Ligand binder design. Structure first.
Ligand SMILES: C[S@@+](CC[C@H](N)C(=O)[O-])C[C@H]1O[C@@H](n2cnc3c(N)ncnc32)[C@H](O)[C@@H]1O
Ligand SMILES: [Zn+2]
Lengths: 122, 164
């Protein structure tokens, strides 16, 4: 799964939006056709989702963002060349997504996000 | 069958999508199976592709893959369009093709959960297309039958739904 999916996925149990937190066992770089993402999901709270992703992928060096790259995107969302590259240019093959409110876990296995056979963490 | 393979039904949906010229959208290919429709959609759009069937996802043409039950794990506010060739076969609850009573059980679940601005849905005569249109209207969708086509076995209806 490419990180732009974090704008599109939600916890299937919580009846309100929550934050899905990424844990990454392994990730590969992908070549960066149409790349549309939900910009507001990545701008809110001064780029909280992006900061969360950058932390989740800190042991992955195939692609990178910086404090500035994020702050500047929050300023001028129109300049998302670096954001797109991060959000579309990485693929998590092995890992997990965890709802920050109820702890529900979506495993990521072979790049597929698994939302049917879930795990509890709370 | 391990997964649903492209048939005349899928190609009538694809033909209708082609004429619409969907472009620059975020599109959810629901029940993507092995991604024949995703393949066409991704040329002009950003596509998320989902299926209940993991085997199909594991042999997918390629895309952004989510194993999910309809839309529960999808934030629909983030999606522009949903495309769905649903399990529509009456009187079976086979997990791939089965629509149970009237072949409508999954269709009806879908219609009652869908909130995106635009949708393309495939149905067959046995599903009672008019009841589907009606349910969609009740959910706030202006509807029209984009295309009708007789294929081997039955007649296919492609429903286009749009909120005002
Ligand atoms: C008739 S097949 C259509 C496949 C393909 N899109 C095509 O047009 O050729 C219906 C698909 O929906 C999937 N499906 C069945 N129940 C589902 C559910 N509850 N949520 C998501 N997909 C489901 C099946 O696995 C199957 O791939
Ligand atoms: Zn939750």
């Amino acid at each position: 799964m490419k990180p732009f999916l974090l704008g599109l996925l939600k916890c299937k149990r919580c009846s309100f939006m929550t934050k899905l937190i990424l844990e990454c066992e392994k990730a590969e770089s992908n070549d960066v056709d149409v790349k549309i993402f939900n910009k507001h999901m990545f701008t809110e709270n001064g780029g909280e989702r992006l900061k969360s992703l950058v932390n989740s992928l800190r042991d992955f060096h195939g692609r990178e963002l910086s404090e500035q790259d994020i702050s500047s995107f929050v300023e001028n969302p129109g300049d998302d060349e670096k954001i797109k590259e991060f959000l579309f240019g990485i693929d998590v093959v092995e890992g997990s997504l965890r709802c920050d409110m109820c702890g529900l876990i979506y495993p990521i296995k072979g790049s597929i996000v698994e939302t049917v056979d879930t795990v509890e963490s709370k | 069958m391990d997964w649903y393979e492209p048939g005349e039904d899928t190609y009538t949906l694809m033909d209708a999508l082609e004429r619409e010229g969907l472009e620059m959208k975020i599109v959810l290919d629901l029940g993507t199976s092995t991604g024949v429709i995703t393949e066409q959609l991704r040329k002009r759009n950003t596509v998320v592709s989902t299926d209940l069937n993991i085997r199909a996802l594991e042999s997918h043409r390629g895309g952004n893959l989510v194993r999910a039950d309809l839309l529960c794990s999808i934030n629909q506010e983030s999606v522009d369009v949903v495309v769905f060739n649903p399990p529509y076969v009456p009187d079976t609850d086979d997990p791939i093709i089965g629509g149970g009573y009237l072949g409508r059980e999954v269709i009806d679940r879908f219609v009652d959960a869908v909130t995106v601005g635009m949708l393309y849905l495939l149905v067959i005569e046995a599903n009672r297309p008019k009841e589907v249109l009606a349910r969609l209207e009740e959910r706030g969708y202006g509807t029209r039958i984009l295309k009708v086509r007789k294929i081997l076995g039955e007649t296919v209806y492609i429903i286009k739904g749009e909120k005002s």
